[PDB]
mmCIF file of C-alpha atoms in Angstrom:
data_model
loop_
_atom_site.group_PDB
_atom_site.id
_atom_site.type_symbol
_atom_site.label_atom_id
_atom_site.label_comp_id
_atom_site.label_asym_id
_atom_site.label_seq_id
_atom_site.Cartn_x
_atom_site.Cartn_y
_atom_site.Cartn_z
ATOM 1 C CA UNK G 1 35.376 18.421 -39.138
ATOM 2 C CA UNK G 2 35.925 18.138 -35.416
ATOM 3 C CA UNK G 3 33.618 15.674 -33.454
ATOM 4 C CA UNK G 4 33.492 16.364 -29.635
ATOM 5 C CA UNK G 5 33.917 13.374 -27.224
ATOM 6 C CA UNK G 6 30.416 12.955 -25.904
ATOM 7 C CA UNK G 7 30.992 12.150 -22.330
ATOM 8 C CA UNK G 8 28.207 10.462 -20.220
ATOM 9 C CA UNK G 9 27.470 12.474 -17.390
ATOM 10 C CA UNK G 10 24.080 14.199 -16.462
ATOM 11 C CA UNK G 11 23.856 16.990 -13.763
ATOM 12 C CA UNK G 12 20.649 16.933 -12.108
ATOM 13 C CA UNK G 13 21.029 19.602 -9.353
ATOM 14 C CA UNK G 14 17.072 19.398 -8.100
ATOM 15 C CA UNK G 15 16.149 18.424 -4.675
ATOM 16 C CA UNK G 16 12.894 16.423 -4.246
ATOM 17 C CA UNK G 17 11.880 17.896 -0.734
ATOM 18 C CA UNK G 18 12.114 14.413 1.139
ATOM 19 C CA UNK G 19 9.093 12.411 1.824
ATOM 20 C CA UNK G 20 6.549 12.590 4.886
ATOM 21 C CA UNK G 21 3.900 9.947 3.349
ATOM 22 C CA UNK G 22 5.123 6.865 5.666
ATOM 23 C CA UNK G 23 4.172 8.241 8.957
ATOM 24 C CA UNK G 24 0.545 8.620 8.228
ATOM 25 C CA UNK G 25 -2.332 5.738 9.247
ATOM 26 C CA UNK G 26 -2.590 3.347 6.404
ATOM 27 C CA UNK G 27 -5.951 1.991 5.002
ATOM 28 C CA UNK G 28 -6.475 0.886 1.239
ATOM 29 C CA UNK G 29 -9.837 1.973 -0.083
ATOM 30 C CA UNK G 30 -12.341 0.830 -2.878
ATOM 31 C CA UNK G 31 -14.864 2.884 -5.142
ATOM 32 C CA UNK G 32 -15.302 6.438 -3.822
ATOM 33 C CA UNK G 33 -17.337 8.060 -0.949
ATOM 34 C CA UNK G 34 -16.489 5.553 1.622
ATOM 35 C CA UNK I 1 13.538 -23.677 4.339
ATOM 36 C CA UNK I 2 11.086 -21.116 5.119
ATOM 37 C CA UNK I 3 11.622 -17.750 3.335
ATOM 38 C CA UNK I 4 9.615 -16.044 5.896
ATOM 39 C CA UNK I 5 8.961 -13.571 3.005
ATOM 40 C CA UNK I 6 5.529 -14.120 1.341
ATOM 41 C CA UNK I 7 3.784 -11.577 -1.200
ATOM 42 C CA UNK I 8 0.988 -11.088 0.927
ATOM 43 C CA UNK I 9 2.338 -7.996 2.498
ATOM 44 C CA UNK I 10 0.468 -5.940 0.180
ATOM 45 C CA UNK I 11 -2.335 -5.648 2.600
ATOM 46 C CA UNK I 12 -0.420 -4.827 5.789
ATOM 47 C CA UNK I 13 0.955 -1.488 4.202
ATOM 48 C CA UNK I 14 -2.413 0.542 3.933
ATOM 49 C CA UNK I 15 -5.369 -2.259 3.573
ATOM 50 C CA UNK I 16 -4.638 -3.461 7.110
ATOM 51 C CA UNK I 17 -2.849 -2.004 10.374
ATOM 52 C CA UNK I 18 -0.645 -3.856 12.566
ATOM 53 C CA UNK I 19 -1.799 -5.204 15.915
ATOM 54 C CA UNK I 20 -5.408 -4.253 15.972
ATOM 55 C CA UNK I 21 -7.162 -7.759 16.768
ATOM 56 C CA UNK I 22 -9.667 -7.636 13.804
ATOM 57 C CA UNK I 23 -12.700 -9.984 13.885
ATOM 58 C CA UNK I 24 -12.862 -12.708 11.265
ATOM 59 C CA UNK I 25 -16.442 -12.592 10.269
ATOM 60 C CA UNK I 26 -18.756 -9.485 9.834
ATOM 61 C CA UNK I 27 -21.251 -9.277 12.158
ATOM 62 C CA UNK I 28 -24.189 -9.016 9.595
ATOM 63 C CA UNK I 29 -22.853 -12.530 8.549
ATOM 64 C CA UNK I 30 -23.135 -13.523 12.140
ATOM 65 C CA UNK I 31 -26.749 -12.576 12.414
ATOM 66 C CA UNK I 32 -27.305 -13.907 8.916
ATOM 67 C CA UNK I 33 -25.913 -17.337 10.300
ATOM 68 C CA UNK I 34 -28.163 -16.928 13.227
ATOM 69 C CA UNK I 35 -31.580 -16.789 11.811
ATOM 70 C CA UNK I 36 -30.326 -19.264 9.205
ATOM 71 C CA UNK I 37 -30.645 -22.083 12.054
ATOM 72 C CA UNK I 38 -34.166 -20.814 12.510
#
């Protein structure tokens, strides 16, 4: 008989261990075994 | 005028590397062009 007020929050609490993928030397490739 | 932001930045991120002075034609093409004059 009592409907709770569904608030709109979503706690996440999850660190992603910040990235290190932009320093490296960069070259796109094609079909494998280059 | 010029937006200076073209969608041709796909290739500098990985596919290419800045400041390297790459050649415009592969050597195989150069030699192929050479003997094609003979």
